[PDB]
Structure formats: C-alpha cells, structure tokens
Amino acid sequence: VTLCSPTEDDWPGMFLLAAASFTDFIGPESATAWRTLVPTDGAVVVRDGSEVVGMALYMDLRLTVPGEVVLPTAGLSFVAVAPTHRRRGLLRAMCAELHRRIADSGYPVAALHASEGGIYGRFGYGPATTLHELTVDRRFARFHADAPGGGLGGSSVRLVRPTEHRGEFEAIYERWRQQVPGGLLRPQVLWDELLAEAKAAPGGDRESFALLHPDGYALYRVDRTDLKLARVSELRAVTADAHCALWRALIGLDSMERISIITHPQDPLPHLLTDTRLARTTWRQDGLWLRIMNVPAALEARGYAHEVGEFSTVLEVSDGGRFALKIGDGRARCTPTDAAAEIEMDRDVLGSLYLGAHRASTLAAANRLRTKDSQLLRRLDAAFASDVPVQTAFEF
Amino acid sequence: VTLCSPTEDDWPGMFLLAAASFTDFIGPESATAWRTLVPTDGAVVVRDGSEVVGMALYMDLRLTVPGEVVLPTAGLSFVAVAPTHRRRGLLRAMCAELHRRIADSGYPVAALHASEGGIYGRFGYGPATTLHELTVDRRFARFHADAPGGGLGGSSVRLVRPTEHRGEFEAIYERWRQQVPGGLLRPQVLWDELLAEAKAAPGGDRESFALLHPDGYALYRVDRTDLKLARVSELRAVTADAHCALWRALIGLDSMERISIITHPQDPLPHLLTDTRLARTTWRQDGLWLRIMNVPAALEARGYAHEVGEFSTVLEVSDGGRFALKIGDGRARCTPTDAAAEIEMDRDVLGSLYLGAHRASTLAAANRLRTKDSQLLRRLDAAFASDVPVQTAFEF
Amino acid sequence: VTLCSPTEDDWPGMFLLAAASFTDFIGPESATAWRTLVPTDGAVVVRDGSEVVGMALYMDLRLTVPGEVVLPTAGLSFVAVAPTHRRRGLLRAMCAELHRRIADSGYPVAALHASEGGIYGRFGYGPATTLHELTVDRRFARFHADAPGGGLGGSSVRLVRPTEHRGEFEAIYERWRQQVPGGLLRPQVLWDELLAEAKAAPGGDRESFALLHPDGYALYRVDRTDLKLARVSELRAVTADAHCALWRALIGLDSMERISIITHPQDPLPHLLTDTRLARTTWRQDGLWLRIMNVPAALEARGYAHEVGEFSTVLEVSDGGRFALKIGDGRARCTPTDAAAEIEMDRDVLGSLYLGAHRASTLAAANRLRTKDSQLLRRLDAAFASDVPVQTAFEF
Amino acid sequence: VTLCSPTEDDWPGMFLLAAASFTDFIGPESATAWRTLVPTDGAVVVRDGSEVVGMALYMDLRLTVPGEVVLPTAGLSFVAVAPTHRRRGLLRAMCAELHRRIADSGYPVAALHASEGGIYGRFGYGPATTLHELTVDRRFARFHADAPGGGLGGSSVRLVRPTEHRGEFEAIYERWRQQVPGGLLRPQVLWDELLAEAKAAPGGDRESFALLHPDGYALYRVDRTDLKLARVSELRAVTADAHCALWRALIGLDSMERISIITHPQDPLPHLLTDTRLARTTWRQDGLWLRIMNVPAALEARGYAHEVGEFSTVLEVSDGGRFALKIGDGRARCTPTDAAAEIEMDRDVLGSLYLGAHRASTLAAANRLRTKDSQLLRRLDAAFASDVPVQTAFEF
Ligand SMILES: Nc1nc(SCC(=O)NCCN2CCCCC2)nc2sc3c(c12)CCC3
Ligand SMILES: Nc1nc(SCC(=O)NCCN2CCCCC2)nc2sc3c(c12)CCC3
Ligand SMILES: Nc1nc(SCC(=O)NCCN2CCCCC2)nc2sc3c(c12)CCC3
Ligand SMILES: Nc1nc(SCC(=O)NCCN2CCCCC2)nc2sc3c(c12)CCC3
Ligand code: NA
Ligand code: NA
Ligand code: NA
Ligand code: NA
After folding, report:
1. Most A CBs within 10 Å: which of B146, B246, B311, B369, as the mutation test of the A interface?
2. Does B148 touch chain A (CB under 8 A)?
3. Shortest CA distance to B325 belongs to which of B358, B302, B307?
4. Domain N-acetyltransferase, which positions (chains A, B, C, D)?
5. Is D78 in the pocket of ligand 4 (CB under 6 A)?
C-alpha cells in the first residue's frame, strides 16, 4: 500500500475503479476531455503490492468570488477507495498528499462537489453554495403586470438546436461566469462534452432544446419517464430582461404540466408570477464545497460590502494561523499576529462564509464560529455578504 | 347582497359556511376561544335577501418587528365566499370594508396566512416570512465536536406531559416572541386551545410529548400513519444552548427514523451535525403575509441595521403615498414629499421587505421594485435586513 | 442517577416513559393485567436527582422446550431509556441488575421480544424462534386430493364471536402450549386482554371473528385500510385435521382476495394446496430471544433426538463456564470440567441453538460456534434439532 | 395434431413460439449455446396440419445430490403451448413422450424450474430447493467480533472485470458444484453466455463487476432503475473464509444503500453481522423441481445421515412401485417387495425429500406422506436430511 502519481499504464485500472465507484460514469472516451484539466502531478493512486485500490486528483479551475475576482482553484474529483480496502486510511493519505501539492503549487483555494455531506468537513471543506430545485406547475403560471416583456411587440427569444449555436452559448456563459460568485471558466472540451449530451440517446435521455436570447440561454429536455415534466439543465442570464424572456418562453411549453430547474435560493422566478407559490422548492442541497488553502491570500483576494464601515479584529483558524483582519472600503488586509483572538473557527467554516452563502450569525448560533462580541458578528455578517447572489456553475 | 357587521344570530350561518369552506375547522366550541380576539366591528358578513354567503374578520394581534418593537396588527381570518356566490365581487367588497375599519382604527399593519398564494397580492399583502420543513434521518445524526452540550455532566432537558408545565411553556414563549421578528403574543385562550390538541384523539392524532429546558421547549407527536416519523409541532428556544439541548433529546428518540419540523431558513440545526445534509429541506412555503396600512408609521416604528451609514431617498408606494425616507443610526424618518421618486413599488412589495425575509435586490431583479441607482438598492438591502432571523409564530 | 425497585408512586412516571418510548402502548388500564405477572423485585427504575429516566422489568413466564418440558422463564419487557439520557450506560446498569436478580431467583433462562435486532446479542440473548408471514391469494387456492377433510360429510368448524367461546379457546391453547417448543402459559388476565382487542374500536381495528374446531381455533379480522385482506392474528391447532379444517374455512372467505398469518417456517399450509407457491412468504423476522442463565440446568432440562447415538464433548461458553457434555437416549448430563474445550461459543449462540430453530452447522459457518471436529458438529446439529417444530406463543 | 421430433426446419417456428411464450427470451443466437445441451431425440414439437403449436425438450445435466454423488439429470425446458391451442391436452401428450424417452435413456431423475407452481405436481415433479432473497441495508451493517477476516493484515479479495478472470471463476464454480447438493455442471457455452450478460447493454442492464478471492467470487451489478441497490447475481464460496471476505467487500460498496442476493435458507450472512435483522428475507420461492424417474436407482445413489442407526421399511410410491427400503451407514438398499407398505407418497413428494430441503414430518402433517409409525417418520426425517445445505446452481 504505497502512494504514487499514476503513469499511462495506471489509467485503465483507475477507469475500472471509476466504473465500480461512480454510477453516473460515462466512460474512458469522455474522460479524455476532463483529463486535459488535470495538471502533471495532479493525480495520486494507491496500488496493492498490481491493481489500483485508491485514487484522487484535482483539476485546474478558475472560480469567480465576490468583487468579480477570479481565483486559481484546485477542483478535487475522481476520489475513490476500492470496496476491498475501506477503513484502511487510504483517503486520509491521498487527501494529505494532494493538499500538500495544491498548497505548494500556490492555489489559494480547493473546491469539490460532495458525494456525501459527512466526509469532507474534517479535510477542511465547508459547503459554500446552495442548490435549489424549483418546479413550476406552468398551467396556472401568469406573469405579473410588473414583469419585463409584457408588451407583445415581438419575442426576442428563439427555439434552436444547441449544436448550431455553440458560439453564442459560450459567449453568454463567459459573460455570466465573470460577473457571478461561484462562476467557473468552462474550457472548450467541456462545451464539446455538454453539446454531445444534448443529442438523444437510444433508450436514454431525449433530445435537448435551447431557448436563445442575446443576453441569456436555457437548455431543457423532456424527462425520460415523466413526459409532462421539462427539466431545465442550464439557464444562464446576464440581464433581468433575458431571465424574464427565457421564463416566458418556458411557461409557453403548453405540452408540459411542470418545468423543473436546479437554481440558487435568490432566483427571482417566483417574483415574476402573480402567485409566488406556483414555483415550489422541491429539493435543497449543498452545491460547491471550498477549502481555503491560504487564509491571508483568500481573505485579501475577495471584495467586501462597501456598506459596513472600517473595522479590525483578530481571526484564529484552528491549525490554520492567527491573523489581524482589517476590512474597509470593500478591501481586506490580513497579516500575522500573536495578539488575542476575537474570532475562532475551524477551516471548513471559513470555506462556508467565503462566497457569502451562509451568515456568520447562523454558524455562530451552532457554535461553529466563536466570538464574545455580537457587534463584531454583525460586522463580519455584513462584510462577507455578496451583493450578487452566489450561484453554482457546473458539477465536476 | 348587502354588507353588515354580524349579530349573534348570524354566527350559526357563519360556522356553516366555515365547515363548508375550511377542511381543518375544529368547530364552534374552539371558535369561542378565537372569537375573544375579534373586536366589536371586527367582522363583516354578506346575506342574500336569509343565509350567510360571505364573511371576513380581523383579530387584535401584537407582532414583533426588527428592533424588538411590538406593533398592533389586524390579523385577517375566517374569510369565505359561498360556492353558490363566486365571481360576484363579494371578497373585494368585504376586504375593502375591513381595510377601511382597520386603517380608521389606527392599525399600522394587517397580517394573514394565505390559503392560496395567488389571491392576496392585489389587496396589498406581500409574503413576509418563509416556512422551511427540515426532516432529519436521526439514525445517522451525530453532533459536531463544536456543538454545545457535548460533556455528559447531566441533561438539563426533561420529558414531560404538556398540560402539567403550561406555566413554563407560556413564560418561554413570552420571552421568545418579544425578541424575534414575526413573534406574536399568544393570549390565554390559545394556550387553552393548544394544550387540548396536545391530548390523544380517538382514531385521530396521538398523544403530544414535551421536551422542557429552562430556556426552551419542543412539543412533538408521532405521525398518525407513519409510526417511524416524529413531528415537532413547536420548538421555542431563547438561547443557543437550549436549541442544541432540545435537538440532542429529539435525536435520542431511538424508536423513530425521522424527525420533521416546520422552522425558518436560518435554523442552525444543520450546523449542529457532522453531516449538514442529514437535515433535508422537504418543503418551503410563504408563512405570514403583511399589508402595510400606514407607510410612514410602519417604516418609522421598526429598527434598521446600524452597519449601513446614514442615507436619504424618496419612496413612492403605488396608490400609497410618496415619502422622503431618511435612515441612519438604525432609525427612519418618513415624511410627505412631492419631490421626484427614486424608488417605486406596489404596497405588497413593501410588506415583503418589512420583516427582512426578502432582499430588495431580489424584488428589483423581478422589477417588483424600480430604481435607477444600484447604490441605493444595496443600501435599502442592508438597512431592511434583520440581525435576528425572521420566524413564524403560529397560524391564524 | 441511582438504580432502585419502583414504589407505587414511580408507576405514573414509568407509564409516561412508556407512552413516549413505545408507539403500540395501550395505556395504564391494560398495564394492570401485565403488572400481575411482574414479581416483587421484578422491576428497576433510574430516577434523575425526580422523574423516571430508565426502567426494565421481567415477568414470571412458563416456556415449553423440546421434550415437552416447561421451564420457569424471566420474560424481560418494558425496557426504556429516556431520550434525554441516551449513551449514559443506563441500559447496561439496569440489565446487569435484573440478570443478577433473575439468576439469584433460580430462573434457568430469560426471554424477550427484540424492538431492534442489534441490542440484545451483547447481553447474551440469541434469536431462538423465527416469525414467517404467509399471504395466500385465496382466489386461486385449491386443496390437494391428499389434504384431510375432502369429503363433504359436514364441516366440523363453526364461525363464532370470540367472547362467547373463551372457555374453548383457553382449553385448546393450554393443550397446544404444553406440546410445542416456544409454547407459553397464557394466564387469565392476558385472555381478558386478548378478548377485549377482539371487539371493534371506533376508527381503529374492525370486529374479530373466530373459526372454532374441537381441536383448533383461528382468530381473524379484516385489515383497517385493505378491505380485501383478512389478518389471522392467531391459529392454534393440536391435530393436523384441525389445521386443514381451519384453513378450508379461511380459504372460504369469498369476500377476501388475501389471507395473511404470522406463523413458523414449518407451517404445512403450503403443502395443503395444489400450488405451494400461492402461500408466499411476505416477511421473516426473529421471534423470541433466549438468554441461558444457568448452562448446566438448561442443557439438562430439555430432551434431545433419540436418533443420534450417545456422545461426549466439552462445551466452553465464553465467560459462562466449561462443561463435560454427555448426550444419549434423548437426555444430557452437564458437569464442571477444566479439560480442554472441543466447542466454544458466546452465551447468545447457545440461546439460538436451545429450541432447535438454528443449526450448529449454520452458526459454525459464521464462526459464532468454534470446533475442530466436523463429526461433533453433525452430532450437535442432530441432537439439538426438535422433532416438533418451534413456534412463537405471543409477544410480551 | 401429431407429435414428432423437430427437424432443423422446425426451429424457426419453435423460436417464434418461444418469443411469444417467454418474456425473458434473449433470441436464436443465445439459443445456439443451450441447443448443444439438447441430445438427439431430446425435443418434441406439435404441428397443426404447418406451424409449431407445442414444444418441449430436455437437456443433459449433471446434478450433485447428498454424499457428493453426481447423477445424470434430464433438465426439462422450452415447454410451450400456443395460446391458440390451450385446453387440448398438448402438454400432457408432450410430457408423456419426453418422460418415456428420459426413462428409456436411463436418467434416474428429471429436473425443471417452474414458470408457475400449480402445473408440475401432477407430472410427478416436487419442489426440491428453496430460493431466499436477502436484502442488506449495508449502511448499518457491522461485522461481528467472531467473523473471520477481522484483522486488517490485507484484503485477499480483488475487484475485477468478469471477462479477464473466466478461468478462475470456472475453477471455483467446478469445486463448488461438486461439493454442494443442487450443484450443476456449467459447460463452456453457458460460461460464454454468462460473461456476455456481464457487459453493459444500451438502455438495458449496467456493467457487472466481480469480487475475486482464491476460494470464492461474487458477480454484481447496480440495478437499472434503483441506483442505490446492488444485485449480487452469483456468489460461489468453497470456504467460510471466502464467504466472509466476499461479504466484507460487498458491505464496502459505500455508494449503495442496499445489497440483494438470491441465496438459500441456510446462508450464514445474517450470523456474520452484529444485527442478524439487517439481512431481511424479501422473497422466497421454490427453486429446482425433481421428478424421480427410477425410485430404486435414485434412493440407492444418494448418501444418508450417519447419525441415524440402521432401519428398514416398505415405501410405496403411488403408481411408482413398492420397495423394501433399508438405510444404514449412510447407504440405502431399495428392492422390489409385495409386503405391506409402511410409507405411502405420490412421486412428487419423493422429489421434494430427495435433496433434504423439506422434512418428511412437514409433508406428513399435510398428509402428502402417510405412515402409522411416528418413530419411522423421525428416522426418515433424519436419514434424508443433508449435512451440506441444498443450494440452487442456475436457472435453465
Ligand atoms: N471530474 C469529472 N467529471 C465527470 S462528469 C460527472 C460530474 O460532473 N459530477 C460527478 C462526478 N463524479 C461522477 C463521474 C466522474 C467522477 C466523479 N467525468 C469525469 S471523467 C474524469 C474526471 C471527470 C476527472 C478526470 C477523469
Ligand atoms: N383564526 C382562527 N383559527 C382557527 S384554527 C386553524 C388555523 O390556525 N389556521 C387555518 C385557518 N383557517 C382554518 C380554520 C379556521 C378558519 C381559517 N380557528 C378559528 S375559529 C374562528 C377563528 C379561527 C377566527 C374567529 C372564529
Ligand atoms: N409486556 C407488556 N406487553 C404489553 S402489549 C405489547 C406487546 O405485546 N409487545 C410489545 C411490547 N412493547 C410494547 C408495549 C408494551 C411495552 C413493550 N403491554 C404491557 S403493559 C406492561 C407490560 C406490557 C409489562 C408490565 C407493564
Ligand atoms: N433452457 C434455456 N434457457 C435459456 S435462458 C432463461 C433461463 O435461464 N430460465 C428461464 C427459461 N425460460 C425462459 C427463456 C428460455 C425458455 C424458458 N435460454 C434458452 S434458449 C434454448 C433453451 C434455453 C433450451 C434449448 C433452446
Ligand atoms: Na482588534
Ligand atoms: Na434624496
Ligand atoms: Na470428550
Ligand atoms: Na419392515
């Protein structure tokens, strides 16, 4: 049981463990695309004596954080221990090695999508974005007098085949990802992958259709089994006009009873309708998990609320350093100190505050975040909040 | 089809329309309790030529708003039109008369619980609180190292019969309702009603049990049909210690698979657990709806965030007045003006912002709230936000 | 947290913990009946400082074992720890005290019905009987030419009201319980209880009917919710003729689609039919759990198979003694020895072998029962097997 | 309506009737494999005037019976009557002809898997093995201290692609089938067939994985529709160590909630766990059905329990002969007699006793097996019991 970077000979063994560990695994051909995002020394494998019993890797990602700042991000993925080698400390060993390589490479943050919500807290990952499924019974849906696009001067939205308008989707996404916290750069190979899932599979998924606006798109397909449910896989809108126009078109799918979308808690769709209740929340889950690798670099890189006035405190991260934290005019300075800590938290708690999806007051109430000053809690709360609501880009 | 205050002779006709309109209607005996909250001239009925075809009333309530301020509130309830007299403008007529009487009586706000989410917007009611059902699979639930009450020095929580500890529940609730936005005074007759539902009904609800702490209680019963689900009807905790202690006791119901509770979006329960995902959101809905009767009185009565610096604007409510609004040091001054409006909104939108449950930015994105200054939107956003999360007291 | 025998003042606190711990708890009035089976010093309670947080008791029972031998049996029941006092070692403390009192009182065996199958193994209880639910689709059920009661000379079975034929049910049960391993004496107060559940409850269970033969009875009721399913609560047959006759009558319930019964794996009902498959096994579970208190007394008290020839071995029970075991002519002699052990097992494994429901070979295969002689395993297997199949009398 | 052996020209008509009669029919290409097991004169067809309206065949099989003895067995299969020609006595005619050919060919036993449990009794087939579905909720599954493979010195089990380890599966199966009653020789063409079902089908079954030990294997796949259920198609273990090791690996499938397997009633899996109840029996059914063609040859060929002492009786099979039966030292001598019968049974009842899956006492209780001596019943019972539990090899 030794720990090594894989060679080309190890990947067939890794694909086997992948097939056996992940039900949603397309196969080696689609793995070519994702492999291009794995740097040299981005992967570890554990061999027994020999076959692959353990694997983990990170991908080179670009993550938008509040203030429209883009951070280099290590995206953890393809993490698996063989069912034959459980409870043997292989995960702890692989996650220790990758975090070493991620930190030494100068990534300020690591990110992952959690297969289960009970594993990643103790490796320093906190849930940072929230997935919100809205189902609309579109048979009752009437738009509000106040909603943009009331006047029937002409619809600016077109129904199109995804593959014939790739260029336009790319351009809209690129604009979207740069202006939204949780935004991720989508490289060319993941657009190739996305538009190949857009075509109908024999006894699988149905054909995907696109609704295209100059400043937004929706990709949607009818559900395999429920033929009265349309699933919106992706809706990217850069302006409120684009968002309303795309929803007017989706509510116009008169052959459907229901439109479902995985969105964020602050999606304005419910407020576009005369009856806010018609857009039911049918499912909620943690989206993206963050591990702050370098506390000073991460806190200094993001923008803060201009509304809160200048303030200073001392932040202790458990086994992560103690820092003089000074926030004002939407910037932070974060410097070493041995002065008494005013705020204590585990590293995962910091990951949860970093994109503004969770309130310091909420984590404080659970005692995940300790302070003896409630004034400082309110100030932390307001400073870390995000003007632009945090969204989730795409699963990796 | 004339509109009148009911006499004692009208109430049997009102109870008939009640039984036929509301499935969850206990009966006339329990109606005695609620009737004591209806002032003289709090009720209107419509007779045909004669039987009751239309009714509506308000109750005298006390509603905690941000800044721990208690407002006199007209609680609309018992609103019904006979199925024989639909689409005849009876609701519009009854709601016009009650709003006249509510305004003339000097209530700054009216409130209701909506039977359907598509009716009350056009009478000026906006959804102001959010109900959040959490279901815990308590078989996997482990408390976090950071959670209060780790040390087994002795449990401060007792399992008790509700009826034998009324005095203690009352005292805890009274403390809770005074310090939480959305808090309502619960008078003696509604405690009588609550503790009578606490006993087992023959081929109905099972016996309710209480978990009692010095600074919190939970009332819970096993579900009629699902014998592995415990439903928490009510959990009132004044301190974070009480909240954790009560949840440690509920997770200790080893005969149950699942604990469900209707709570608020900011419930810290998920952060008390090693796996935040174990507390799934199974249901979300609008709780309390507010109609601001008097815009200047309501905006001046509540406290604002001390974090946002002093700022001035002109607010126009559609058919509700135009006001010079000046916010600073957590207070607002709101005075008549004919100066150009910087913010426009329908009255219902104001009701939705009033308790801090919805963000101005979110309503702005749906065009429910118009401005041409995004700086003013952020300032509005931060000022109207509530330090203490908004909760829902009890249905009426 | 002290451990004491309850006084009359403690029982209201015990009934509260009962209501909160057991969903199927009738109430204090029916508890009078069961209380008469609890000896003086049969109960322990744990008080905190004061309320009941822990309880356990045993009842005086009489258990038929192979060879038609009746043993005095301590029936453990009413075991509960308050959800407020979990993971505090209250169960381990109460079970240690009761086992002390049971052993000192001279009970050779203790018995219980397990609320969950993961608790009782480490207190020395092994599952000893198996519950088998058969559902018959009685619309296809035709009796075999070979089945007794083919000739229509006249039915010896009567449809009757349970309460009017108590005397006859008692006499048949008394005959049944004396000749079947797992048989329990049913005292008068449990017949009072049984026949009170036989009457219809308002918005609860439907009326119970009886099928009465000179040498058998069935009690059955239609299911609350499924009106085409008849549930046989109890079928006691002393002769094969009685068993067939009762099943001919149940298959004649022409208003039902399905007859379900909780029976034992060796129920001959499937072999009475032309299509054995029509009697589906819809559910299987551990019935009665045994803890052998005194290994020598228990092994000497039961009869063994006359078919296996005389043989000698040394049995070690983990922390339970080592014994020279000599079996021949259906009797065992069991005497102290320090000679080398040929068979090792935990005490619970012995409880599982004691009524002949599990095979030594099966437990050996799981390594619950160690030996280095496979000849001795076959001999153990054959000797402990029961001529009369083991059944389950009634839940306690 | 004449009865004939098919020619090559008849097989397309037989495949048509197959497709229309059997939902699980792969097609003619996979039928090539099974056809190689059909001897010359192993098949009958009924033509009308012309198309195939009736068919039946037997395959040359090798069946392990108690005492590790292998019998030549006629495996009945591909039995179908056209829906156009029901209730015309075609089955009775085809089954009479095949049984003639089977008996004349010198097969001591015939075997089949029953499509329905109500047909085959009257042609002399009795159910001889029992299929037992266990579902494990593997999230709660903890292995017992006593279970082999506790020490984490290194896992002896490998996760592998089935097709790359055919040789090893074959060798383990061959060892297994020779030492277990109900074991069947699996020829090369059925290994070809098995490993072709092991690969993923487009919009069909998912990829099959193998867990490989030196002395056991498991083949498993995730369910089509339920992505949290793993179905074990096949688990062959020659030693108890192999059986435990394979189950430790399956419980380590951390992406699954449930593991299901079709096994036998005596599977020790439940005893490997701290909570025996976690391995629920979710389904039970007759496996293999036996028709004893030659009573003297079949009774003389199998081994008997060495534990029962020598005894003699006279067995009458209804329309099957009367025999002096003498059993001692695990052998039987079975010779013609006209002496008074002590045991009577139909031929199917003998098929049910032959592999030791049913007890003579159980069949006696249903009056399927008549005697006036209960001593002789116990002796029959013990003699026919199988030391090694009876399992089911594979469906044909
Ligand atoms: N990072 C990768 N993603 C995907 S698509 C599935 C997805 O979006 N989320 C679930 C991830 N989970 C399931 C399947 C893959 C493993 C983990 N496919 C692939 S192939 C491959 C990677 C990858 C990383 C490099 C090799
Ligand atoms: N305000 C009142 N509440 C209740 S209890 C039911 C509840 O909490 N919410 C649903 C209200 N809805 C159903 C039943 C009553 C009518 C509307 N019972 C009664 S009786 C009665 C009132 C009332 C108002 C005065 C007469
Ligand atoms: N031993 C007793 N049995 C019963 S009836 C229910 C039953 O048959 N099995 C489930 C037992 N379980 C549920 C309800 C009681 C507690 C445990 N009722 C009562 S009341 C009472 C006892 C008892 C023991 C003495 C006081
Ligand atoms: N004996 C044969 N088995 C099979 S695979 C299906 C199975 O294992 N059991 C269900 C059998 N039942 C369904 C499908 C076939 C007919 C009966 N396929 C084939 S093709 C073929 C035979 C056969 C016998 C010779 C021609
Ligand atoms: Na400071
Ligand atoms: Na101004
Ligand atoms: Na010996
Ligand atoms: Na004889």
Report:
1. B146
2. yes
3. B302
4. 1-148
5. yes
Cβ–Cβ under 8 Å, residues D328 and D151: no
Cα–Cα dist A319/A321, whole Å? 6
What is the chain C residue with the closest CA to D267?
Answer: C362
In CATH, what number does B292-387 get?
A: 3.30.1050.10
Query: CA angle A21-A26-A32, nearest 5°?
Result: 105
Task: Spot the catalytic one: D120, D123, D173, D217.
Answer: D120
Catalytic annotation on D396? Answer: yes
D1-128+287-291 and D292-387: same fold? no
Nearest Cα of chain B lies from the Cα of A368 at a distance, in angstroms, of: 6
Could you say which of B118, B274, B382 has the minimum Cβ distance to residue A307?
B382
Ligand nearest to the CA of A21: 1
Q: What angle do CA A393, A395, A396 make, to 5 degrees?
A: 120
Phi and psi for B114 in degrees, rounded to 5? -85, 125
Nearest CA to ligand 1 atom 22: A34
Distance CA D296, CA B313 (A): 107
Within 8 A of A16 by CB-CB distance, chain D residues are 159-161
CB D62 within 8 A of CB D185: yes
Cβ contacts of B28 within 8 Å, gap of 6 or more: B11, B15
Q: Coil, strand, or helix at residue C375?
A: helix
A62 is in an annotated binding site: no
Interchain contact C240–D (C-beta under 8 A)? yes
**Fold annotation for A129-286:** Aminopeptidase (3.40.630)
- Asked whether B307 and A360 are in contact (CB, 8 A), the reply is no
C-alpha span between B297 and B317 (Å, rounded): 14
A201 interface with D at CB cutoff 8 Å: yes
d(CA B181, CA B63): 8
Q: Could you state, in order of their start, the residue ranges of all structural domains in chain C?
A: 1-128+287-291, 129-286, 292-387
CATH of domain A1-128+287-291: 3.40.630.30
Q: What is the DSSP letter of B342?
A: S
Q: Contact B251/B143 with Cβ under 8 angstroms?
A: yes
SS3 A281: strand
CB proximity A303 to B under 8 Å = no
The b/e string for C47-69 (b: 16+ C-beta within 10 A; e otherwise) is bbeebbbbbbbbbbbbbbbbeee
Instruction: Name the experiment that determined this structure.
Output: X-ray
- Measured between beta carbons, the chain B residues lying within 8 angstroms of A308 are 307
Q: What is the resolution of this structure in A?
A: 2.5
Q: Which chains touch D (3 or more CB pairs under 8 A)?
A: A, C
Note whether A84 contacts D154, CB cutoff 8 Å. no
Residue type, C89: G
Residues 6+ away with beta carbon under 8 Å from B30:
B193, B196
CB-ligand 4 contact for D31 (6 Å cutoff): yes
Residue D131: both structure tokens together: 């299929």
In the block, residue with structure tokens 């992952």: A112
Cα–Cα dist A64/A288, whole Å: 12
Under 8 Å CB pairs connecting chains A and B tally to: 132
**How close A282 gets to chain D, by Cα (Å)?**
20
Structure tokens given for A130: 């929230």
Cβ partners under 8 Å of residue C357, min gap 6: C127, C128, C129, C130, C386, C390
**Surface-to-core class of residue B152, CB atoms within 10 Å of its CB (0-12 exposed, 13-18 middle, 19+ buried):** exposed
User: What's the gap between Cα B196 and its chain centre?
Assistant: 22
Residues 255-294 of B with CB under 8 A from C: 255
Number of H helices and E strands in chain D, helices first, is 10, 19
Q: Identify which of C300, C325, C328, C296 has the alpha carbon closest to the alpha carbon of residue C313.
A: C325
Distance CA B289, CA B301 (A): 18
